[PDB]
Amino acid sequence: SVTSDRTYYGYGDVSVKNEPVNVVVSPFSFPGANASLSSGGQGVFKKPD
Amino acid sequence: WIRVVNQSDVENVKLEIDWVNANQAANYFDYARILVTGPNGQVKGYLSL
């Protein structure tokens, strides 16, 4: 009578949500406060973070 | 006579002093020699007709 269609199934799901990286920024204001930059001046400025 | 005031950043300055009406004082003076006394007893400048 019944000629079974021999076909069973298995399934799965994958969730890719985020991007690998977050670039958190703290911008710099290099002449800063309690220091001074002059025209034609020479030197170095550094922000560690 | 001439005071130089600089910012907390500037540490080297090169000034050019120029006598512009020297052709005028020539009609009045016979010899005029200006000595520009520097910071702490140094003499760094000499101006003549």
Ligand SMILES: [Ca+2]
């Ligand atoms: Ca400097």
